[PDB]
Structure formats: structure tokens, C-alpha cells
Amino acid sequence: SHSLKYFHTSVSRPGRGEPRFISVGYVDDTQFVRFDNDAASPRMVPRAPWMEQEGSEYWDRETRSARDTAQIFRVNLRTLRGYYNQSEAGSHTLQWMHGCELGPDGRFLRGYEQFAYDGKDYLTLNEDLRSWTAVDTAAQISEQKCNDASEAEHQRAYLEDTCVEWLHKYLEKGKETLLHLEPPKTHVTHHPISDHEATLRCWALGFYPAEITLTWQQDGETQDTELVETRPAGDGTFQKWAAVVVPSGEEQRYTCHVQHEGLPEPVTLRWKP
Amino acid sequence: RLPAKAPLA
């Protein structure tokens, strides 16, 4: 259940030259490449150790691809600005997310592309990968446009063939890191917040991939869990905690339940004093 | 790797 995905971001800065443009490539939950046009002669560069052995033919191609996308996304920012009847003074954010997924058998499973203007779903590619769903009535003009040019055709060819082929190449090149299942190191911490209440915080540290399920249960049978967003440790692994407010003295009634690919069976924790 | 074509809206 692997994937190769890219996240493109274009930001119009009127009167301060061409827009800001950034591409980042991810295999599963590991960034491996990046492009930033905010530099003189900007280039696609390796951002995983296992990507530095690729030839300059690769980087030259990726550079040109990312450069042409920046150029197209500049035009797109002009066009969309025109559709929403917005000013040439405001800064506007076009976001593009595309990727392919491999099944259990390791063959193509599914592809997706989505556009967003000012952080809002704009134009989604359908699961048939041959047509678009304009989420907004402003995106209808775009939908009609991308169908006239048979734009989905070329995206299908990338998502079905090229994307899957290179996902396989990356999974081999970076296999020592990418195919390693680091399970969470898990524990419970008690934080008194008042006379009557305390906080049980269930930790999961240095786990990969990022997908993890943390839930609190009570012997018998609970308050609604505080669940912080999954954060990077900065070493390729991830951290996450789930917290629950409980009456003080009644902490050993609550169990934490962790689920991760790197765990054969789900782990149960309980706070001991 | 990146797709060669970027859709024009």
C-alpha cells in the first residue's frame, strides 16, 4: 500500500516579479526531492540520502519539468484571478496534489489529482482518470477547457504508467529506509491540571510510517479525547500523543490502545504510579 | 518523477 505523490504551491506576488513556486516529492511519508524557484538558476535537488546517486540527466529533466510547471501555474494564477473577478493587487495561492498508489500485489491500484485556489477544492480528477469534477461553478470554465485539450489523457498516462514505474525504482533505491517498519515506543504520562482533574497523555515516539491509531478506553466504560496532529521528529520518524481529562485517583481505570503497521498485535498501555 | 505536462485551467 505504497505511493509516490507531489505537492506543488504557486503564490502570486504582483509587482515583485514572477510568482513563488515550490514542488516537493514524497514516497509514502518520506520527502525525497524539492524545487524552489526563489533562487538564481533554480534546480530540482535530492532531499533523501538514497537520491544523490541519480545522474545529472535526471535532475536536468526534473528541473525543466518543475520550471515549465511554474510557468504554467503563473498563467493559471492569471486565469483564475480573472474568473473570481479579483484584484491584480492581492496575493493568491494555487495548489496541485497528484500521486499514484500500489496495491498489495505491487501493481497500480489508483491515481488522483486535485487543484485548490486560496486553500479551497477547485478541480478534482475523477477515479476514471479521464474527466474532472469542478467543485465550484468558477471551475466549470476550467473543466470545459481541460476536456477540450484532453488534459486528463496525459495525466492518466503519467499516473498509470510513469508514476508506478518510478515508484518501483525509488522503493528499490531507498529500500533500507522506505521498507523499514519502525514501531512506536509508547508510554503514559500523568499531568494534574486541577484539584479534581488530571490529564493522561498517551505517547507514540519514533514510529514510521506516519499512519497510527491512538484511542483511550475505561474499565466498565470515558471523556472525549484530545488528539494532537502527527508531527515529524526530524529524523524520518514521527511523534503523536492522545490526551484524556480524568478524575484524579481514577487513572488506573483508563487504558490506551495503539495500532501501527510495525506492531504485529495492537499494544495496550495503562498508567502505573 | 514529475509529469512532463501541467494542466492549463
Epitope: 525543466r64 515549465d68 510557468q71 498563467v75 477540450d148 485539450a149 484532453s150 489523457e153 496525459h154 | -
Partner: T-cell receptor
């Protein structure tokens, strides 16, 4: 992208049928376009075939597109002296931002 | 309407001299291209534009500059004329590259000869 036109020069008697060929390395194209050039003049578009389209017919000219094969065939039915000119082939480049052209086939329809 | 207009039609340059090949279209075409044509080499994309203030280089861009200040005009500047740049230069525009309305229109062409 590279576009090749086979042959480079063609000389056929008037009244005869003839094929101008054009093949391209990259199949992922939007449009293929055939052009005419008279000596010391510019290019005038003859036919435009979309990626989705298969045929485009204009009188005695029929251009065909096989995206898979990566070739287009321009059929000139019952040739006339007035056809004597240079014919060029062009597809949308990798980026899809400008047309990339072949050397072109220099046609001479002898009277 | 005039289609695509080019000036001059013929020009002679001494090596090192600079000049601007003028090109304009009154068809409001967002896409404009500059090509050179020399025997058995075909049409070689020098520079291309996808709108006002957006420029990029093609197959053989070395020796030339371009500006797309306006939708209407796409001048080509030879910075330092060389014998190798002796060719016939064609300016071209189209409403679309990827769309159904992709008819590309060319200028009458500029014959340039550079001499020592």
C-alpha cells in the same frame, strides 16, 4: 521530441496520388499540424488534428493521426503542378507550450 | 486585420553589430514563437512566450534575447551578430497550443546575412 518526415524530397508526375509521412518520438502530444511553404514565403497551416481526432480532410488533402504508432500520413489525391512546394510537420513539445517542426518534404509535381 | 507582421524582410549586418527583428500580431494570441530556418536543419525554436511578461528559450537560443512587454509585440534582439546566425527567422503566434483552436500563423520571414 524529434519529428522526422520521410522522404525529404519527392518528385511525382501530375495526376498521381502521393503520401507525405511524419513520425514523432513522444506520443503524448495535444495537436499535430501540417503546413505549406512557398519559396521565400512564410508557412500557412493546411490541417490541424487534435490528440482525440483521427482524420482531417481538406479537398484533395487527407491527414491521418495514429497517436500509438506516433506517425501522421498526409495523402495528396490526384496531384497537380500547383502542389509543388515544401510541406512541414509539427507536434506540441514535451512542455506543451510551443510546436516542434520536422525538416519538411520538398515536393515537385512535374507538369 | 494583418495576421503576423515582420520587419525587416531583408537585412545585412557586420559581425558584432546588434539589431531588433520586429514582430507583432493583432489577433490577441497569448502564445508567440521565434524560429530560424537554414537548409536541411528545418525550423528550430529560438525563443517562445505563453503570455505578456513570460519568456523562455527553445532548441537553440544562444546569441538572441526576447521581450513580451505587450500581448501584441514579441521583438527578437541579436546582441552580437555572428556568421553562424546567417539564416531566415520566422515569428509565429496561435490562440492555443493545447486547445482545438491551435491554428499557428507565421510572418513573411526575415532573411538575415552576417559578414566579416
Amino acid at each position: 521530441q524529434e519529428v522526422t518526415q520521410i522522404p525529404a524530397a519527392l518528385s511525382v508526375p501530375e495526376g498521381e496520388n502521393l503520401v507525405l509521412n511524419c513520425s514523432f518520438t513522444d506520443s503524448a502530444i495535444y495537436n499535430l499540424q501540417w503546413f505549406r511553404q512557398d519559396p521565400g514565403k512564410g508557412l500557412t497551416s493546411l490541417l490541424l488534428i487534435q490528440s482525440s481526432q483521427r482524420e482531417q480532410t481538406s479537398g484533395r488533402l487527407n491527414a491521418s493521426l495514429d497517436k500509438s504508432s506516433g506517425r501522421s500520413t498526409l495523402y495528396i489525391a490526384a496531384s497537380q503542378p500547383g502542389d509543388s512546394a515544401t510541406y512541414l510537420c509539427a507536434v506540441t513539445n514535451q512542455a506543451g507550450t510551443a510546436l516542434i517542426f520536422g525538416k519538411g518534404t520538398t515536393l515537385s509535381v512535374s507538369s | 486585420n494583418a495576421g503576423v507582421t515582420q520587419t525587416p524582410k531583408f537585412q545585412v549586418l557586420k559581425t558584432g553589430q546588434s539589431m531588433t527583428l520586429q514582430c507583432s500580431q493583432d489577433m490577441n494570441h497569448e502564445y508567440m514563437s521565434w524560429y530560424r530556418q537554414d537548409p536541411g536543419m528545418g525550423l528550430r525554436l529560438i525563443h517562445y512566450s505563453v503570455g505578456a511578461g513570460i519568456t523562455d528559450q527553445g532548441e537553440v537560443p544562444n546569441g538572441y534575447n526576447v521581450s513580451r512587454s505587450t500581448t501584441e509585440d514579441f521583438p527578437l534582439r541579436l546582441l552580437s551578430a555572428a556568421p553562424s546566425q546567417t539564416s531566415v527567422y520566422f515569428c509565429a503566434s496561435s490562440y492555443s497550443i493545447r486547445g482545438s483552436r491551435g491554428e499557428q500563423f507565421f510572418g513573411p520571414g526575415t532573411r538575415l546575412t552576417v559578414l566579416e
